[PDB]
């Protein structure tokens, strides 16, 4: 099998405004095989109520999923997406950058 490591974008559904409810998104794509572990973190801790989209795939057969949760951005709280996949030796952590 071809193993392909995930691309990861971490971003909000709406423009981030401190103190206002929003959705934090972690979009994983370009990966194969489909088995993948994705957590969203707040200050390094696993957020509990995280949902994801139904598995689907792109023209090149690589898979994509959207994981998401309601959150409230603030000046100080750090959000991140943590991903593990067979192609990775250890979980990859991508911090949410509100400019990206």
């Amino acid at each position: 099998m071809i193993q392909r490591t995930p691309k990861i974008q971490v971003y909000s559904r709406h423009p981030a405004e401190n103190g206002k409810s929003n959705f934090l998104n972690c979009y994983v794509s370009g990966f194969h095989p489909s088995d993948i572990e994705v957590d969203l973190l707040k200050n390094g801790e696993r957020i509990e109520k995280v949902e994801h989209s139904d598995l689907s795939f792109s023209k090149d057969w690589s898979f994509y999923l959207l994981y998401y949760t309601e959150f409230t951005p603030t000046e100080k709280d750090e959000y991140a997406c943590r991903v593990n996949h067979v192609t990775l030796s250890q979980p990859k952590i991508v911090k949410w950058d509100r400019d990206m």
């Binding site: 099998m1 971003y11 095989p33 489909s34 088995d35 689907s56």
Partner: protein, 275 residues
């Protein structure tokens, strides 16, 4: 404009115990409207858009019957493919299938397609003429001979040109309020100094639909690709999409650069400039 209806199937074998995981999703254009997940409790095809909910029990019974039958075909496939490829009973493998039809802006059939993959590589595909198959290797060649003997292309061409297009038309009508609405990208530019001498400009396209979009940077009216970055188009999670393109420029020269946005929802392309 043109429209499509597509189904995507994924089946993943579970060597240590039980049946494969099977997930199916149906789309009209970039809108997901149904799903089936073998692991879910319902064991039914489920709605994922409001406009499909008005279909009656017969519809849902029929979709459920078909999708479960499909899942069982992929189940047999995974077993045969392990044998074709002389693979251990120990490993997990994947089959993927995608099929669908397009209609043009007159809602008449434009094209149809079906592609099948094993472990993330092309395996067998219907040709654009809907009459014959492409096989990637000698395993798929065996499958091609089986599918030729069973006259599959003929049956699939029937679906693609008939019932696929007829139901796409029905959905487009019933779901008109969203499926025939175009959401032009909401665009703006942000500015991010990188040093005393350089700054990034980032051209944003937000809350658009459908997903197809082109963002281009120009400098003094010529396309620029060096010193740019373009992210993959990504889902907002409310059915719309987002994308951005960025360029690094010398501080003070921002006004030379323009971002150009093309999208079906835009009668003319938009041009953004930092001032």
């Amino acid at each position: 404009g043109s429209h499509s209806m597509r189904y995507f199937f994924t089946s993943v074998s579970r060597p240590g115990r039980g049946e494969p995981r099977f997930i199916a999703v149906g789309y009209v254009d970039d809108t997901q409207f149904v799903r089936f997940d073998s692991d879910a409790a319902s064991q039914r095809m489920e709605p994922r858009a409001p406009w499909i909910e008005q279909e009656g029990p017969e519809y849902w019974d029929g979709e459920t019957r078909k999708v479960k039958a499909h899942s069982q075909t992929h189940r047999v496939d995974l077993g045969t493919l392990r044998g074709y490829y002389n693979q251990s009973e120990a490993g997990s493998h994947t089959v993927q299938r995608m099929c669908g039809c397009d209609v043009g802006s007159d809602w008449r059939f434009l094209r149809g397609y079906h592609q099948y993959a094993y472990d993330g590589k092309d395996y067998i595909a219907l040709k654009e003429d809907l009459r014959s198959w492409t096989a990637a290797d000698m395993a798929a060649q065996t499958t091609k001979h089986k599918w030729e003997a069973a006259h599959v292309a003929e049956q699939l061409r029937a679906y693609l040109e008939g019932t696929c297009v007829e139901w796409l038309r029905r959905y487009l009508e019933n779901g008109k309020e969203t499926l025939q609405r175009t959401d032009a990208p909401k665009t703006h530019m942000t500015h991010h100094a990188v040093s005393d001498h350089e700054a990034t400009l980032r051209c944003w396209a937000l809350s658009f639909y459908p997903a197809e979009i082109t963002l281009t940077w120009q400098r003094d009216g010529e396309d620029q690709t060096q010193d740019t970055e373009l992210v993959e188009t990504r889902p907002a999670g409310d059915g719309t999409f987002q994308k951005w393109a960025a360029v690094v420029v010398p501080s003070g020269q921002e006004q030379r650069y323009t971002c150009h946005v093309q999208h079906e929802g835009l009668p003319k392309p938009l041009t953004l400039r930092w001032e």
